[PDB]
Design an enzyme around this catalytic site. Structure first.
Site, PDB file in Angstrom:
ATOM      1  N   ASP A  50      -3.819   7.232  10.112  1.00  0.00           N
ATOM      2  CA  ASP A  50      -3.006   7.081  11.352  1.00  0.00           C
ATOM      3  C   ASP A  50      -2.740   8.459  11.964  1.00  0.00           C
ATOM      4  OD1 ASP A  50      -2.675   4.232  11.259  1.00  0.00           O
ATOM      5  OD2 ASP A  50      -1.089   4.507   9.711  1.00  0.00           O
ATOM      6  N   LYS A  73       1.189  14.293  14.238  1.00  0.00           N
ATOM      7  CA  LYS A  73       1.511  13.824  12.870  1.00  0.00           C
ATOM      8  C   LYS A  73       0.343  12.998  12.359  1.00  0.00           C
ATOM      9  CE  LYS A  73       5.186  11.785  10.302  1.00  0.00           C
ATOM     10  NZ  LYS A  73       6.218  10.740  10.120  1.00  0.00           N
ATOM     11  N   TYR A 128       0.846  -1.219   0.000  1.00  0.00           N
ATOM     12  CA  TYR A 128       0.000   0.000   0.000  1.00  0.00           C
ATOM     13  C   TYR A 128       0.874   1.258   0.000  1.00  0.00           C
ATOM     14  CZ  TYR A 128       0.844  -0.249   5.092  1.00  0.00           C
ATOM     15  OH  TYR A 128       1.402  -0.366   6.331  1.00  0.00           O
TER      16      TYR A 128
HETATM   17  O1  LIG Z   1       4.477   8.016  11.481  1.00  0.00           O
HETATM   18  C1  LIG Z   1       4.539   7.127  10.447  1.00  0.00           C
HETATM   19  C2  LIG Z   1       3.555   6.166  10.267  1.00  0.00           C
HETATM   20  C3  LIG Z   1       3.647   5.272   9.203  1.00  0.00           C
HETATM   21  C4  LIG Z   1       4.725   5.299   8.323  1.00  0.00           C
HETATM   22  C5  LIG Z   1       4.838   4.376   7.126  1.00  0.00           C
HETATM   23  C6  LIG Z   1       4.636   2.884   7.360  1.00  0.00           C
HETATM   24  N1  LIG Z   1       3.448   2.560   8.157  1.00  0.00           N
HETATM   25  C7  LIG Z   1       3.789   2.203   9.526  1.00  0.00           C
HETATM   26  C8  LIG Z   1       4.279   0.775   9.652  1.00  0.00           C
HETATM   27  C9  LIG Z   1       5.203   0.424  10.626  1.00  0.00           C
HETATM   28  C10 LIG Z   1       5.619  -0.889  10.767  1.00  0.00           C
HETATM   29  C11 LIG Z   1       5.128  -1.864   9.933  1.00  0.00           C
HETATM   30  C12 LIG Z   1       4.213  -1.534   8.960  1.00  0.00           C
HETATM   31  C13 LIG Z   1       3.791  -0.221   8.815  1.00  0.00           C
HETATM   32  C14 LIG Z   1       5.693   6.282   8.506  1.00  0.00           C
HETATM   33  C15 LIG Z   1       5.619   7.184   9.555  1.00  0.00           C
HETATM   34  O2  LIG Z   1       6.597   8.129   9.732  1.00  0.00           O
END
Ligand SMILES: Oc1ccc(CCNCc2ccccc2)cc1O
Length: 159
Positions: free
Chosen positions: A104, A85, A71
């Site tokens: 999120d 954030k 995704y």
């Molecule tokens: O605050 C943030 C929240 C999310 C991200 C991208 C990835 N999603 C989060 C995640 C973590 C661990 C396993 C899968 C997905 C970046 C950010 O800086």
């Protein structure tokens, strides 16, 4: 047309580091590029499209087997005043499982001079027929794993 369902999930992590120390990492344009340098085993791959600041897009691919596969996420907002954030899933993942909206939110809140709590939440809107299917799949797991990782980066730099 029956009403869309709204679901919220919430995770919190107490930290013995100041809200600034932890916000500086969450708000760091270079955090995205550091992500495998933080969570190995998670990602097959991670393309970054932009500066790494607000408006940056992440294409995320997970290791064969587990759902979802791929995704795209977009940094929507950073607010240094509130240490808030927001990161929206903009394509793939749950959005192909009747979720119309997935956001999120990370709020780093001071609890005294040298300590804070990381308040991570996810809000989603899902077509009511798909709620049985997706409710078991959307967990704090991803944001917990980020909260843990950031926490142990900072406590090792401060120690
Ligand atoms: O605050 C943030 C929240 C999310 C991200 C991208 C990835 N999603 C989060 C995640 C973590 C661990 C396993 C899968 C997905 C970046 C950010 O800086």
């Amino acid at each position: 047309q029956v009403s869309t369902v709204t679901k919220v999930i919430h995770h919190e992590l107490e930290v013995a580091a100041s809200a600034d120390d932890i916000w500086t990492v969450y708000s760091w344009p270079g955090l995205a590029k550091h992500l495998p340098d933080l969570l190995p085993g998670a990602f097959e791959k991670l393309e970054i499209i932009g500066d790494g600041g607000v408006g940056t897009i992440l294409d995320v691919t997970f290791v064969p087997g587990e759902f979802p596969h791929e995704y795209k996420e977009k940094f929507i907002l950073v607010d240094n005043e509130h240490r808030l954030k927001k990161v929206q899933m903009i394509e793939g993942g749950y959005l192909d499982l009747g979720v119309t909206y997935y956001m999120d939110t990370i709020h780093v809140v001071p609890t005294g001079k040298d300590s804070c709590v990381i308040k991570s939440s996810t809000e989603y809107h899902v077509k009511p027929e798909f709620v049985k299917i997706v409710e078991p799949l959307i967990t704090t797991g991803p944001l917990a794993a980020m909260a843990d990782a950031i926490s142990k980066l900072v406590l090792e730099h401060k120690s």
